[PDB]
Design a protein around this ligand. Structure first.
Ligand SMILES: [Mg+2]
Ligand SMILES: [Mg+2]
Ligand SMILES: [Mg+2]
Ligand SMILES: [Mg+2]
Ligand SMILES: [Mg+2]
Ligand SMILES: [Mg+2]
Ligand SMILES: [Mg+2]
Ligand SMILES: [Mg+2]
Ligand SMILES: [Mg+2]
Ligand SMILES: [Mg+2]
Ligand SMILES: [Mg+2]
Ligand SMILES: [Mg+2]
Ligand SMILES: [Mg+2]
Ligand SMILES: [Mg+2]
Ligand SMILES: [Mg+2]
Ligand SMILES: [Mg+2]
Ligand SMILES: [Mg+2]
Ligand SMILES: [Mg+2]
Ligand SMILES: [Mg+2]
Ligand SMILES: [Mg+2]
Ligand SMILES: [Mg+2]
Ligand SMILES: [Mg+2]
Ligand SMILES: [Mg+2]
Lengths: 242, 96, 173
RNA sequence: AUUCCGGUUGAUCCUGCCGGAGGCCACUGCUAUGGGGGUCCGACUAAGCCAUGCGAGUCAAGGGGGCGUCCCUUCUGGGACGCCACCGGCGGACGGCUCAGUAACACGUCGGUAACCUACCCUCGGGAGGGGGAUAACCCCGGGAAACUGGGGCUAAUCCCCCAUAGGCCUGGGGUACUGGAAGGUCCCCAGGCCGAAAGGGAGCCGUAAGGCUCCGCCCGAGGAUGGGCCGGCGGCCGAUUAGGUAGUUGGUGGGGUAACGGCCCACCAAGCCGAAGAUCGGUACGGGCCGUGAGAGCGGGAGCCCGGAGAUGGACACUGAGACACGGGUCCAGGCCCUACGGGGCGCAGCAGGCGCGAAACCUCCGCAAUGCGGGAAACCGCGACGGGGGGACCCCCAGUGCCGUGCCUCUGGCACGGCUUUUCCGGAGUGUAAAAAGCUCCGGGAAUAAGGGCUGGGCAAGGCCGGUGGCAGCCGCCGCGGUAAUACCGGCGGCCCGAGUGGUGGCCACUAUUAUUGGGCCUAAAGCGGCCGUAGCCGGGCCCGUAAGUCCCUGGCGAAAUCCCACGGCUCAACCGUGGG
C-alpha cells in the first residue's frame, strides 16, 4: 500500500479465527466492509463451500448465492464477500435448517444448530449511545447497526446492556441489564467460550479498561474484560448455547 | 470387478445426488468409465443420460479403486451447472 | 532472515577412520544385509532421538511433561520395542540391534517367507509381500506390532501358490 | 561424544601458535539408472544497455448511430435478431519486480488521537420540485513525410449548468439532554453571515387503457466497518590517529498554512538546546519474523517464503482523483540512443520470455484461464506472463535399482560351471489420469536381460616391506617431511582401504580454542603491574531497631500475526510433505 488501499489477501496472512487450509493455495478472499470486524467474522463464500459443503468450486457457490438461497438475519445476501459474525443467524429455508455463529473454545468460528422458534431473535450488545437531532437517542450496537428511541425511554438503556431484537423486522422485545447475577458468555481472550454469572466489577484510573469476575457452574472464579462479557439472560440463558 | 456404494448424499440446492463408491478388482486393470457407468446405473435404476462420473482413481499397491459420481434430476440443470470439459470427457456431448 | 531448508535425517561419524567403530559397523552391515552405511546411520539416529527424549523428561516436572512421558511410552511399546509393563527407565537400555530387528526385511526372513536376508530384500522390492492387505516395497519400513501377523505373500503373486518351484525350495528349509 | 592427535630437544617438562579430524553455503574436476515432495535457479561484479511479442480491462438492463438477417403491412415504415465503433460509468493508486538510498520514530513492541481523512460495503432517519446547454459518433472539404491535427452541418443521455428547498461551516449570547477517567465534542433556543444536493433514471409482467407489482439504481444526515496519516516511552552496529557542536538553533507570545497537532513557516521577545553515561563528524548497512553452528553460555548471517520501508536512467515539479506528485499517464534540465522528405518527431524491461555486456558465477522468445483470487457486470459471463501446467538444470530432502536360489570346484570373502526363479528398473500395448497433454498408478506380452564411479595407500589416519621405470633430476608435500643408482612416500602395473549415484579441488562462517575467558584465562624468571604518590566521577562498602515498597519473589487480567521448531494421532504405499490437537 504505497499509493492506496489493499485489495488482496494472502492465505498465510489470513485471520486466525477461520477454518481454512493455509498452504493449499496462494490467495484468500478479502472480505468486504460490513457489519462486524475482521477478527470476529468470516466471508459467506467459505460458509457455503468449506463449512457446510454445498458446493465444490467457487463458481457454483456463486450460482447458489445469486438465486437467493441463504438468509442472514432474515435478509437475502448475494455477495460472496459479505461478512458473517458472532451471534448471527444463518438460515436455509429450502432445506429448513438454522445455525448460530459462535466462537469455539480455542477461538475459531463454528455453526451451532438451533430451532426455528429461536431463529427469529438476535441478541445485540449496546456499544454506545448518543443524542441525535430532534433530541432523540441513537443506540449503536456491537455489530454496527443502529436504532432510535424517544427521549422518554432514555433511562432504560445503558452501555453493556443487551437488547433482544426480532429479525428481520427489527423490533425490540426484551432488555437485559448488566449487573450482579447476570448470565454472561465470553467472546474473546484466554477465557473465550466460557459462561457464567457476574460477581464483581472493578474500575481503574486514566482510561484503563474495567474488569469483571465470573463464577461458572462448578464454582470456579475467573476474570475478564468488561467488554468481552456478553449478557445472555437474567439467571438462565435466553438462547441455546454449547 | 465388484462395486460397493459407500455414501449417497442429497443436495436440494443444486438439485442432484452425490455418490461415492469403491471397486474391488484383484488381477485386473482399472475399470473403464463405460463399464462403471453401466453397472452404477443398473444397481441404482437411474437414467443414464443424466449421470456423470467425476473420477476413478487407483492407488499404489491396492486391489481397489475409488470413484465419485453425480446424478442430476433434469438435463437442463446438468447442462447449466457442470463445466463443458467434464461433459465432453464423459461422452455426454460432442466437442466443437 | 532466511526461509526453511530441509535437513538430513541422519548423522555422520565424527572421525571417518577409527578402527573399532569400523569393525563393529562391518559386523552389523554383514549380518543384516544393508546397502550402505547411511542406511545404518539412519537407524542409529532414531535410537539416539529416543534416548535424548528420555533423558530430558526424567529431569522435568509439570503438566505437559507427564503427557509427553506417557506419549513416549505408548509410542515405544506400539512399535514392539518394549513390553507392555515397561517404565521410563527401560528406555535407556535399548540397543541398535533392537531397532534393526523391526525392519520389514528382517521380519520377512524370520517368519520363514524367505531362506535368506537377500532373498527377502528382493521379495519385498519386486512386490511379492503384502502387509495388512497392502503392498509395501520399502525394505526399511518399521513394522508395528499390531500388524505383524498379517504379513503374507501378495494374493496376485506367483509365490501365492503352494506348488511354485521357488516357494517349495523355501519351504524345504 | 561436554574428546583430542602431529610439529621447538641428543633426550625432558612447559608456554604458545600453525596443521589435521566435523557441519553448512558459493564456484569448479571427473562420473551418473529411477521415482516422489518442496517456500531452489542473472542476489554478490553493471540500480549497466536493450530489437520483437505479450504483462488491465469491462458494462448492449446509461445513450444516440452504422451494417446484416427475417416478419407485418410495406410506395414510406414499424418490428424482432445479431454485430461494430463512439459518447458515458467503474477500474487502471492493487497485483508483479529490485534492494540503490537511508544510522532515521526506518523497523519491533506497548500505548495515544478529546489533534485527522476515507470511493466501494452495513444499519437506521429523510429527499428526488422547475428550467437551460453544448458536443463525439454521423455528412462536406481537408493539412502534414510521418507523429499528429483544422473549418463548416446536425444529434442524445444516469453528460454539463442554473433556480428553489433540505443541508454544511464560522462567531457572539443563553440552557444543561448524552458519552466518558476527564469535554475546545454531541443535543435545545435566539442572533449576524458565507457556501450550497439529487437520475423516479433503466428492465420485466399484469395492464384495453388508466396504474400497479417486483428487479437494479440517484442525493443529504448520524454511526460503524475497511484502508491509512500523525505522536510518544522502551529495544537492537564499528571508530577518540574524530572534542566540542548548534544561530530557526532551544523555548515564549501573536499569526499563517494544513485533512489534522507541531519552528511546519513568518513577525516580535529572550539565551537557550546537545555532550567523555561519547555529542558532532566519518565508515558500513534496508528492519524484523527467522537461518547456520555449538553440550550449553555464546559466536556469525539476514537474497528466495510472510509482514513493514523505499525506487522506476540521475535531479527537480505539477494535472486528475476518495486515494498519486503515478513503472506499461504529463513538463523541464543533464546524459545516452532511434526515425526523417531535414521542416520535425519519438524511446529508457530493477514485469514474463529473449539478446548483448560484465564476470568464477545463473533456464523456454512454451500451453491455459479448468483450479485459487482480483477488476467489471442484474446475471450468464469476459480479461489477467498474478496464479496454475509443463520444458532446461549433479539446488535441497525422502524411498529404490544395478539380480536371487540350489549343487559342485576354486586362491573358499569372492570367482567359475551347471539347473531353476523373479521383473522394481528397461522395450511394446489397453485403461485411468489431465483444461488438453506428459508423468504417475492398475493390468497384459518379451527377457538377467538395459545400468559403477571418485579419492586414498610413510605418520596424523583405515589400507603393500610386492614388481618395473627415474637417480638432489623429474616430481610429491594442508603440517611433519620424501627423492644423492638397493625409493613401502615420485611415475606406472598388480593387489588393498574408505565412502558410494556420487566422490575430490578452491574460497567463506561456526566448532576445534579456557587462542576473548559472565559461566571460565593470564601478568617473579615465558607476552603482560603505570618510576612513585595524592585525589574528582564511577564501582564496592561495618553492627542493631522502626517505616516504606523502587529493585526482587508469588498469584492473576490484556498482548507479543501466520509460516518456521518439538510431540501424539490421522491422509498420500511408509516416508519427505500435508491436516486436527497439545506445547
Ligand atoms: Mg531480509
Ligand atoms: Mg626451546
Ligand atoms: Mg532473486
Ligand atoms: Mg543486474
Ligand atoms: Mg503500485
Ligand atoms: Mg546497499
Ligand atoms: Mg443550490
Ligand atoms: Mg543488519
Ligand atoms: Mg531469461
Ligand atoms: Mg550456479
Ligand atoms: Mg602406486
Ligand atoms: Mg594404520
Ligand atoms: Mg585452529
Ligand atoms: Mg594462556
Ligand atoms: Mg610498579
Ligand atoms: Mg616496571
Ligand atoms: Mg587514590
Ligand atoms: Mg551492612
Ligand atoms: Mg516492587
Ligand atoms: Mg507465531
Ligand atoms: Mg496409507
Ligand atoms: Mg505417519
Ligand atoms: Mg501443517
Amino acid at each position: 500500500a504505497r499509493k492506496g488501499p489493499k485489495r488482496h489477501l494472502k492465505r498465510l496472512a489470513a485471520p486466525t479465527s477461520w477454518y481454512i487450509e493455509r498452504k493449499a493455495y496462494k490467495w484468500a478472499v478479502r472480505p468486504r466492509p460490513g457489519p462486524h470486524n475482521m477478527r470476529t467474522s468470516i466471508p459467506l463464500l467459505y460458509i457455503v463451500r468449506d463449512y457446510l459443503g454445498y458446493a465444490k468450486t467457487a463458481r457454483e457457490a456463486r450460482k447458489i448465492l445469486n438465486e437467493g438461497k441463504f438468509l442472514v438475519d432474515g435478509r437475502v445476501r448475494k455477495d460472496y464477500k459479505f461478512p458473517v459474525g458472532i451471534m448471527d443467524v444463518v438460515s436455509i429455508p429450502e432445506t429448513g435448517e438454522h445455525y448460530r455463529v459462535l466462537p469455539n473454545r480455542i477461538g475459531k468460528l463454528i455453526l451451532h444448530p438451533i430451532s426455528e422458534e429461536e431463529a427469529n431473535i438476535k441478541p445485540l450488545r449496546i456499544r454506545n449511545k448518543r443524542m441525535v437531532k430532534g433530541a432523540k437517542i441513537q443506540l449503536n450496537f456491537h455489530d454496527g447497526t443502529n436504532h432510535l428511541i424517544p427521549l422518554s425511554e432514555k433511562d432504560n438503556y445503558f452501555t453493556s446492556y443487551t437488547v433482544l431484537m426480532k429479525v428481520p423486522e427489527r423490533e425490540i422485545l426484551e432488555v437485559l441489564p448488566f449487573e450482579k447475577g447476570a448470565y454472561v458468555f465470553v467472546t474473546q481472550g484466554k477465557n473465550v467460550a466460557r459462561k457464567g454469572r457476574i460477581v464483581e466489577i472493578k474500575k481503574f484510573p486514566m482510561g484503563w479498561p474495567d474488569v469483571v469476575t465470573i463464577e461458572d457452574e462448578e464454582g470456579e472464579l475467573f476474570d475478564t474484560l468488561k467488554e468481552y462479557a456478553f449478557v445472555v439472560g437474567r439467571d438462565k440463558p435466553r438462547i441455546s448455547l454449547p | 470387478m465388484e462395486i460397493k456404494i459407500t455414501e449417497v448424499k442429497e443436495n436440494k440446492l443444486i438439485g442432484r445426488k452425490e455418490i461415492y463408491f469403491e471397486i474391488y478388482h484383484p488381477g485386473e486393470p482399472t475399470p473403464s468409465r463405460k463399464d462403471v457407468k453401466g453397472k452404477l446405473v443398473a444397481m441404482l435404476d437411474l437414467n443414464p443420460e443424466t449421470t456423470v462420473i467425476q473420477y476413478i482413481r487407483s492407488y499404489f499397491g491396492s486391489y481397489k479403486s475409488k470413484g465419485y459420481a453425480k446424478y442430476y434430476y433434469d438435463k437442463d440443470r446438468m447442462l447449466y451447472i457442470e463445466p463443458e470439459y467434464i461433459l465432453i470427457r464423459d461422452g455426454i456431448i460432442e466437442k466443437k | 532472515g532466511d526461509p526453511k531448508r530441509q535437513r538430513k535425517k541422519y548423522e555422520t561419524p565424527p572421525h571417518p577412520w577409527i578402527k573399532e567403530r569400523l569393525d563393529r559397523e562391518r559386523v552389523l552391515m554383514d549380518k543384516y544385509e544393508l546397502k550402505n552405511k547411511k542406511e545404518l546411520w539412519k537407524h542409529e539416529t532414531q535410537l539416539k532421538n529416543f534416548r535424548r527424549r528420555a533423558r530430558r523428561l526424567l529431569a522435568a516436572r509439570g503438566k505437559q511433561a507427564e503427557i509427553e512421558r506417557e506419549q513416549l511410552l505408548a509410542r515405544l511399546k506400539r512399535l514392539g520395542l518394549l513390553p507392555e509393563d515397561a517404565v521410563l527407565d527401560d528406555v535407556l537400555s535399548l540397543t541398535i540391534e533392537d531397532i534393526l530387528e523391526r525392519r520389514l526385511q528382517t521380519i520377512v526372513y524370520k517368519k520363514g517367507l524367505a531362506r535368506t536376508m537377500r532373498q527377502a530384500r528382493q521379495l519385498i522390492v519386486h512386490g511379492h509381500i503384502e502387509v495388512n492387505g497392502q503392498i509395501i516395497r520399502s525394505p526399511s519400513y518399521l513394522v508395528l506390532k499390531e500388524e505383524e501377523d498379517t504379513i503374507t505373500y501378495a494374493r496376485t503373486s506367483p509365490f501365492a501358490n503352494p506348488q511354485h518351484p521357488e516357494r517349495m525350495m523355501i519351504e524345504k528349509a
